[PDB]
Design a protein around this ligand. Structure first.
Ligand SMILES: *[C@@H]1O[C@H](CO)[C@@H](O[C@@H]2O[C@H](CO)[C@@H](O[C@@H]3O[C@H](CO[C@H]4O[C@H](CO[C@H]5O[C@H](CO)[C@@H](O)[C@H](O)[C@@H]5O[C@H]5O[C@H](CO)[C@@H](O)[C@H](O)[C@@H]5O)[C@@H](O)[C@H](O[C@H]5O[C@H](CO)[C@@H](O)[C@H](O)[C@@H]5O[C@H]5O[C@H](CO)[C@@H](O)[C@H](O)[C@@H]5O)[C@@H]4O)[C@@H](O)[C@H](O[C@H]4O[C@H](CO)[C@@H](O)[C@H](O)[C@@H]4O[C@@H]4O[C@@H](CO)[C@@H](O)[C@H](O)[C@@H]4O)[C@@H]3O)[C@H](O)[C@H]2NC(C)=O)[C@H](O)[C@H]1NC(C)=O
Ligand SMILES: *[C@@H]1O[C@H](CO)[C@@H](O[C@@H]2O[C@H](CO)[C@@H](O[C@@H]3O[C@H](CO[C@H]4O[C@H](CO[C@H]5O[C@H](CO)[C@@H](O)[C@H](O)[C@@H]5O[C@H]5O[C@H](CO)[C@@H](O)[C@H](O)[C@@H]5O)[C@@H](O)[C@H](O[C@H]5O[C@H](CO)[C@@H](O)[C@H](O)[C@@H]5O[C@H]5O[C@H](CO)[C@@H](O)[C@H](O)[C@@H]5O)[C@@H]4O)[C@@H](O)[C@H](O[C@H]4O[C@H](CO)[C@@H](O)[C@H](O)[C@@H]4O[C@H]4O[C@H](CO)[C@@H](O)[C@H](O)[C@@H]4O)[C@@H]3O)[C@H](O)[C@H]2NC(C)=O)[C@H](O)[C@H]1NC(C)=O
Ligand SMILES: *[C@@H]1O[C@H](CO)[C@@H](O)[C@H](O)[C@H]1NC(C)=O
Ligand SMILES: *[C@H]1O[C@H](CO)[C@@H](O)[C@H](O)[C@H]1NC(C)=O
Lengths: 607, 608, 305
């Protein structure tokens, strides 16, 4: 699809106006879910068409109210905000004004002063529109309708089932079925803002980095929109903002003598060294000469994979990390600065050097933090819950390829991202799924030459039709937890068999990408039983003993499920969500957290 | 406050707003003398140059963000810094006035702009600002550095003391502790939003509105202050909820008459509560750079408040407070402002049937007060006069600072229809004659500032000993029978409450609010018959209080406020299980079983 | 045999170290009622824990408990109900005579149990009072007249300089809760204040010392980092710091440590007691809190030395 998606920033040529805070909100509870479109609510302020309530942004809407119908609502929700713009934006026609929505859900439509201006399919990814025309020819009214319905061609997929036995269900009953283990929160869960650029502007930047002996090589490619009469100057600044290299034009290669490489946290005493690429555009326009500035952080580092090693900067790397989720009390998947910083403080405390974005791209601000703190990332698209054969077809395939393209567009420049994951626990025993995954992986590889690609599997080693195409094998297993309930004594044997079976077949590096135990804080027993803190500890110890037998050979990582307790749909196996966290949902450590911490610092200190 | 107005920043045709939320660079100054940052003048250069720094979210308290043991209980100076790229028009167009606004800080805060000393403020929970136009209009990113001191002293509000313990057989060299006498954690940081905003160089600086009723008509009495040029004219228009003009006038003062007015009613007092008009002030002024226009719009709720010998009247009708005490407190962010928790809390209040809260024990974020106006939740707006426990805290110096603090409180919140009473203190040592005079003067000062509302302080004194009680318009009583004495003895509660109300009313003949009662309650602890700390004990204690309240709430008891809305953090001690557990909601905003009980009562009272 | 020197507690002529617990006769529903399953469970947990001793805080336990000690090898400091003697009016000639008779009954019942290795005549009496000093002298003398075969003590929380009973004991037993009952939350002070405690007590008295109580109220499932009072992390850390201090003297003149308490137990209602006393390393239902595992490791380590 079209154009770049650079994270907005202030610069000499660009302003940003955050639209955080209260928006007006209404769920459309009409039987056919379309009354808002029938009455065209967007033509007028939202309150004119019925009761509205306040909804905070960014936030999920699902836990904010005490309305019993809203948490599990399936349909369109309607948000609205009125903004007073700086007069300079609306009167000075050299100003380009952009409305950026950080994310939405399955579908979103945006109206600006009642005019339909922007649409987007799929959650967890940003979208924007140049609204200069609507702003410059006295309030801006922004209306956003968001659909949260998951279907056989959304990512994640789902199904909708109407149940028409009127002796067991009321007239019109339907439910949303899903096959992924996290709650389908919705809303405007990420920051919404307006920003400006000149009418000729830096639209896209692509950087890749390599090393020559002790030299750093920074390849850049720059895309400009608007006038095709311009010049580009590019500088690379060191940590103290000294110019160490410079160039020109839409593309080039900068050389950095005696380069400071970007190293993961605990892989170097001074990890995460960031240079900055300052891009300066001088263009000739219809109203005279314009200047545009954008500055992109750059970490000079390489990623490679052998038959048994995962190499960062040509040195063997071992993932000792976690899986996370965008999830917290009350706000759901809503972005929050204090929770963000707290989580990173906990990651560093834990000795974690990595996480996977189970199971969707996280807020960009999370990736920025990773680049700065040296926490490597397996960046994963929302290809989770692909459990039924009907989800694997040509339309879903091409949709999945488009989403991966979006993920790569957004995140291609983060040094912290060291691998792409295209799915989690797809039905990859299916031959249709093997082809599907072959093609999504090949597509991803064709978009970014610089990173390995994988998908995370719970398939049997002999049956997995996607396994041949991954650069690194990522395996989920929960021995004694999802089978042989309580039998801690079986873990080492089953794990040994797992690794031997998989490596014998594929001769590719393996990551244990999930393992854990549901654990209710304060539940204690000796001997240990499932759900106690002691069972969590024991299960971790047995996994750790298994991992020890192969982690200096061909197992190149371990990621605990999960960093913290998080919300899921109601079911008899989910005690107010998923409780496999090593931290509580309120970011305090269960006893197992300390056990894992010891392990991670011990492994890190092996040098 | 002394220096001019303090209107809540908003965008208008003449005014912009740029929030500075997100990451700031941060360092605590752990030097032995706590002054290295001033000795080395860290503010003269980017903060990272003077040593290690870390990220700190704003708004948030700093105390719970890290895993650093010594940071949570740190006492001294912390240093924050942000760099800002400003719009070119702000720096280049000399008609722009650029203002730096800090929502709140702590005991002391100093602010530097590009290394230049620019703004200082004493006391927490209250906003302060400076015109920085000259520093931005040089002819480069703006660097804002803020040092915040969290030390409480005999002359701070809340007060405290510092104790150096020199017995090296028991304490390491240099050991000191902050002693306090209030029951909430002394969190610190940039807990409220920091922003830049603009106005013209001649601008609307202050607005004061008061409202009254004549038969069927609303009266809106306005007073406007303009700073900058001396030559100007003002237009004022009152707009109804559908934005049509209902009244209009001119000048620096006047009275708009509103025919057939829609009064502002508390939640559940009327089917359509919280009716707000808007007062749109348009300034036209002649300046050195030509004529300018300034626009500011103030929400207005037309309502009156009065106190009789037995009733609290809103719009001339008897009102009964059935509400809660709150705190600015949540996991991780401490006292940090947060939009989701704010909306959640208001949803829970309306679910509960609560029509009121007290800002125990400091003014809350302005955004909270704005929500109270819009949701119809009335407010007893309380300054940080809590922990005044020791004779030494009542000094002529403490009294002046307290008077100034009330001035800031009144300046900030005087225009909120939801605020129906000022509280100048909570549980001061009001048995003391010095405390009685001190309170007399703070209260008199407050009354002189604001003619439109009653004034109180909240007491746990014995009715015979309370030297402050004569000066309050409404008597507000804290009591915890069976909890803080006669442990477990639920059977005593109705008797002791009856005695309380009889004694207090016989002495004073003024309306009474039960401003605190409750029980520490650990969610999940159950026992029959009930024992302290169980949910059943909380329920039973509430039931007994409610029965006592019922005997006087149609007579001279005009309110009840449960302690507390939610579990919140305190200092460590053997009586505080990870803070105060008297919430009817958990700190994560879910109801304990007692919440349902209180809810049924409040709706029942509302429907009478 | 049992004997005491200026620095050692000797069983069968060999240096002994108490690594044990305090208990109570206390369980859900039955209160102090005797129960066979709970008895056997507790001894199974004592052995699992590596505990070699307990004190019968603060009253003699059922005879059956003593029979178990004899068969399982868990030594006992057998303590009479001389607890709560906090007021001056409790130290009179009438109370003294009564206490002497109670000690007679205690000794008569338990004199033949090999597991009982020491009598304790009181717990935290107001032993700073000169009347209390005389009172305890007499009860101790009376106890020795009844049984020549065992040492006698009482358990103290007095200031070392003020304790008027301390001259009369064979073994000094001290209770302290640094960072818990004072300097709330200050885990960093424990090692220092404990060093000072041992140095002061031993300089003055030159008799073997048992740390007879230490601990932290701990609600199972409360967690925080950094640790706060009432969390499992705080219990662990307080224990760790106490252990480090004990380590500095446990091969010199400190001859025992007894954690308070084996399990959470019931008390009167008050603002400092969350449904009773929560200082257990086990819950009232006999499951381990995380600190129980920490103590277990220590006890087996010490045993193996
Ligand atoms: C920002 O945050 C700051 C940090 O919290 C805060 O500063 C603190 O302010 C509090 C008061 O609010 C002060 O607490 C009082 O301290 C009184 C003693 O003060 C004197 O001694 C202090 C310690 O000195 C030792 O350490 C320093 C630093 O290393 C060293 O320089 C000295 O040489 C000493 O060294 C010995 O000990 C070291 C270990 O501690 C060891 O390493 C060394 O080897 C030595 O053994 C000292 O800090 C004080 O210094 C201040 O004052 C002098 C001017 O006199 C000035 O030059 C300094 O720059 C300091 O100035 C700051 O603070 C002062 C306030 O004192 C303020 O005026 C300034 O503007 C500036 O902010 C000083 O030398 C102590 O007496 C007092 O306690 C009494 O009073 C209280 C209240 O009444 C009672 O509760 C107490 O019990 C006690 O009184 C009792 O009752 C009285 C009767 O009334 C008496 O009869 C009884 O017997 C009993 O005494 C307080 O504890 C605290 O010292 C100070 N800390 C520091 C580090 O500065 C600052 O104000 C905040 N600023 C803002 C704007 O918010
Ligand atoms: C925004 O949110 C919306 C709300 O979620 C999304 O809309 C939903 O999309 C779902 C798919 O994601 C749809 O689910 C599928 O439904 C079909 C059946 O569709 C037909 O019937 C529907 C129900 O009709 C009744 O109710 C409606 C609602 O009030 C009325 O309008 C009807 O008049 C009718 O009313 C009677 O009953 C009601 C009680 O409910 C009474 O009150 C009345 O009095 C009447 O008695 C109906 O909703 C469907 O209408 C859609 O399609 C029409 C075209 O045919 C179109 O005109 C409509 O505008 C509407 O279009 C919208 O949805 C379609 C998708 O269908 C989109 O193309 C379009 O873009 C619009 O968004 C229609 O009339 C059902 O067959 C499916 O189930 C099969 O397939 C799944 C997946 O494979 C399987 O898992 C199932 O098992 C099942 O397959 C089996 O079926 C049999 C099982 O028994 C078995 O026999 C077979 O073997 C087979 O294998 C799905 O369930 C859902 O219908 C739709 N809901 C609504 C209200 O629109 C919306 O898409 C989303 N938008 C965006 C952009 O994100
Ligand atoms: C880098 O910048 C300098 C100074 O502007 C310029 O002279 C030089 O040509 C640049 N070097 C390049 C383009 O490699
Ligand atoms: C306000 O109403 C109109 C609109 O400006 C105007 O005609 C009238 O003079 C004003 N009334 C006043 C100043 O009272």
């Amino acid at each position: 699809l079209q154009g770049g998606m650079l994270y907005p920033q202030e610069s000499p040529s660009r302003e940003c106006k955050e639209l955080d805070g209260l928006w007006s909100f209404r769920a459309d509870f009409s039987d056919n879910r379309r009354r808002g479109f029938e009455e065209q609510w967007y033509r007028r302020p939202l309150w004119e068409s019925g009761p509205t309530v306040d909804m905070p942004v960014p936030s999920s809407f699902n836990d904010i109210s005490q309305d019993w119908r809203l948490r599990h609502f399936v349909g369109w929700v309607w948000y609205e905000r009125e903004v007073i713009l700086p007069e300079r934006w609306t009167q000075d026609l050299r100003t380009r004004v952009v409305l950026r929505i950080g994310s939405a859900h399955s579908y979103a439509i945006v109206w600006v002063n009642g005019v339909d201006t922007l649409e987007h399919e799929g959650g967890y990814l940003p979208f924007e529109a140049d609204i200069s025309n609507l702003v410059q020819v006295s309030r801006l009214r922004i209306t956003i309708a968001i659909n949260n319905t998951l279907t056989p061609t959304t990512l994640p997929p789902g199904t909708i089932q109407y149940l028409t036995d009127t002796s067991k269900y009321p007239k019109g009953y339907f439910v949303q079925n899903t096959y992924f283990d996290f709650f389908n929160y919705a809303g405007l869960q990420r920051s919404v803002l307006l920003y400006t650029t000149p009418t000729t502007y830096i639209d896209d930047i692509t950087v890749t980095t390599s090393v020559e002996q002790d030299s750093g090589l920074v390849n850049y490619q720059i895309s400009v929109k608007g006038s095709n009469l311009f010049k580009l100057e590019v500088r690379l600044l060191d940590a103290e903002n000294k110019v160490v290299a410079n160039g020109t034009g839409t593309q080039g290669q900068l050389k950095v003598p005696g380069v400071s490489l970007w190293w993961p946290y605990l892989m170097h005493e001074r990890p995460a060294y960031l240079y900055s690429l300052e891009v300066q555009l001088t263009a000739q326009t219809s109203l005279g000469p314009v200047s545009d500035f954008y500055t992109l952080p750059v970490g000079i580092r390489t990623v490679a994979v052998t038959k048994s090693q995962f190499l960062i900067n040509g040195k063997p790397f071992y993932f000792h990390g976690v899986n996370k989720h965008e999830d917290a009390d009350i706000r759901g998947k809503g972005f929050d600065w204090p929770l963000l910083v707290k989580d990173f403080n906990l990651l560093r405390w834990l000795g974690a050097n990595a996480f996977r974005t189970s199971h969707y791209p996280y807020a960009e601000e999370v990736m920025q933090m990773c680049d700065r703190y040296g926490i490597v990332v397996i960046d994963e698209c929302p290809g989770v819950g692909l459990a039924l054969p009907q989800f694997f077809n040509n339309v879903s395939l091409h949709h999945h390829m488009q989403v991966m393209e979006e993920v790569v567009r957004r995140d291609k420049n983060h040094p912290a991202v060291v691998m792409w994951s295209v799915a989690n626990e797809p039905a990859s025993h299916l031959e249709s799924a093997g082809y599907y995954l072959k093609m999504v992986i090949a597509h991803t590889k064709s978009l970014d030459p610089s990173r390995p690609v994988t998908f995370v599997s719970n398939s049997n080693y002999a049956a997995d039709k996607g396994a041949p195409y991954v650069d690194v094998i990522c395996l989920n297993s929960y021995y004694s937890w999802y089978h042989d309930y309580g039998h801690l004594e079986l873990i080492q044997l089953q794990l040994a068999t797992q690794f031997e079976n998989w490596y014998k077949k594929y001769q590719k590096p393996i990551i244990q990408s999930e393992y854990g135990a549901e654990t209710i804080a304060g539940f204690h027993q000796d001997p240990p039983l499932m759900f106690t803190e002691e069972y969590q500890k024991s299960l971790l110890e047995q996994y750790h003993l298994g991992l020890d037998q192969k982690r200096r050979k061909y197992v190149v990582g371990e990621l605990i499920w999960n960093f913290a307790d998080f919300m899921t749909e109601q079911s008899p196996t989910r005690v107010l969500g998923n409780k496999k966290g090593i931290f509580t949902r309120q970011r305090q450590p269960k006893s197992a957290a300390f056990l894992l911490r010891e392990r991670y610092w011990k492994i890190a200190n092996e040098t």
